[PDB]
């Protein structure tokens, strides 16, 4: 159960980062990170897939209700690979990922605010920031985490967000999933060299997941070892 | 600048279509729009033209377009937000597949599971050209009137 919660994020992920690490500002604010970079990045055979990530909170006008909300330019595999359940609708095709449709995913709570009526979501349009957006899918949270006190959150194909309501080449991050059952330790340094190449400087700054995965795996199985062993010893004593 | 003036006998709209779609949008194509504040009160008219000079909001260039809506009763304040529907073509007598259940092998080939009269779902490869914001105009490989398991489809799966 707990591993399924953990492996729910698969194998693996190398989110791309600027600056130095998590706490950095200006060097992290600047991003020499073309989404085009992914091309050659996706070119490596061991990789199964790798995906762009970006997000922007913006004001959202609508009919009468008129409030800002966070939003998330992402892959269509997002709710898929996260396995996030849908309140309604689906994610989106890669074709329409290229289609730049004004399709979009929203919080159920966001609907709770927008829609006292509980009107059907699909086919409806609501502007984000400025651009009109024909809402379709909305997804229920797959975690409780009530202490998070989650606010309004929204999801877009990244091509649309970063594209036709941002236009920057530099997305917040890029997920990178390896194939082959390949080890987390290896190649991440090779990708590091890769960023030492396609960029001229030490700018990978990425975090990684079979490291923490394998170690918590050894941890849990170790707990199995202690528990089952002392149990069986006691029973043999019986 | 002592004082500004404006003629409100008719209202012009600045419909900022994205640069990706500007290549289409032939003049005189019929279009309609509606304001956020009145929810449902459609206005409509001919498109007039396209402005030669773009202006941008950081990322992504946008090109304007204009109408010429009549303004009875003194409604529509200046710079009011207005959602705008511009019309592309209406080819007819042809099926379009909802995108919710599409299968797309190769990214060219396109399998699609559909329920049969037997209660057996079965997929078929199909070719499709035209694509829509919501669906895709299928051209071959599926009959009209066919049941189509839009939700949680799998091939060969009798229900």
């Amino acid at each position: 159960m707990v591993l399924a919660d953990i492996r729910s994020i698969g194998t693996n992920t190398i989110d791309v980062y600027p600056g130095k690490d998590f706490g950095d500002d200006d060097p992290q604010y600047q991003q020499a990170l073309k989404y085009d970079d992914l091309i050659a990045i996706q070119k490596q055979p061991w990789v199964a897939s790798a995906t762009p990530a970006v997000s922007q909170n913006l004001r959202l006008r609508y009919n009468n209700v008129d409030v800002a909300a966070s939003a998330n330019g992402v892959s269509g595999d997002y709710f898929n690979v996260y396995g996030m359940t849908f309140s309604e609708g689906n994610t989106f095709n890669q074709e329409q990922l290229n289609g730049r449709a004004q399709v979009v995913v929203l919080d159920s709570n966001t609907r709770r605010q927008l829609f006292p009526h509980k009107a059907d979501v699909v086919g409806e349009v609501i502007l984000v920031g400025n651009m009109p957006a024909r809402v379709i899918g909305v997804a229920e949270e797959k975690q409780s985490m009530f202490g998070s006190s989650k606010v309004l959150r929204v999801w877009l194909p990244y091509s649309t967000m970063s594209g036709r309501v941002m236009g920057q080449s530099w997305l917040n991050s890029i997920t990178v999933r390896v194939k082959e059952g390949f080890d987390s330790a290896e190649a991440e340094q090779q990708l590091t060299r890769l960023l030492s190449l396609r960029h001229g400087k030490k700018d990978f700054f990425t975090w990684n997941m079979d490291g923490v995965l394998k170690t918590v795996e050894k941890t849990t199985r170790t707990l199995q070892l202690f528990l089952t062993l002392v149990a069986v010893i006691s029973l043999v004593v019986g | 600048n002592i004082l500004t003036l404006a003629d409100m006998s008719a209202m012009l709209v600045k419909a900022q279509v994205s640069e990706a779609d500007v290549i289409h949008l032939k003049p005189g194509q019929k279009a309609w729009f509606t304001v956020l504040g009145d929810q449902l009160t459609r206005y409509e008219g001919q498109i007039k033209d396209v402005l030669p000079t773009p202006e941008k909001v950081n990322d992504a260039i946008f090109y304007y377009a204009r109408f010429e809506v009549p303004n009875p009763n003194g409604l529509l304040r200046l710079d009011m937000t207005a959602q705008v529907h511009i019309q592309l073509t209406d080819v007819k007598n042809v099926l379009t597949i909802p995108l919710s259940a599409l299968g797309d092998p190769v990214g060219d080939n396109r399998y699609k599971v559909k329920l049969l009269r037997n209660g057996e779902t079965r997929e078929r490869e199909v070719t499709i050209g035209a694509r829509n914001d919501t669906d895709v105009e299928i051209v071959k490989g599926l009959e009209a009137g066919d049941e189509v398991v839009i939700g949680e489809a799998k091939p060969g799966a009798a229900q």
Partner: peptide, 22 residues
């Protein structure tokens, strides 16, 4: 486990491609 499937009746439809814009 119910094999229940959401489904639709396809018909010779007419194209409604036009898009939108703020």
């Amino acid at each position: 486990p119910v094999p229940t499937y959401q489904t639709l009746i396809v018909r010779p439809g007419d194209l409604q491609q036009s898009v939108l814009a703020t």
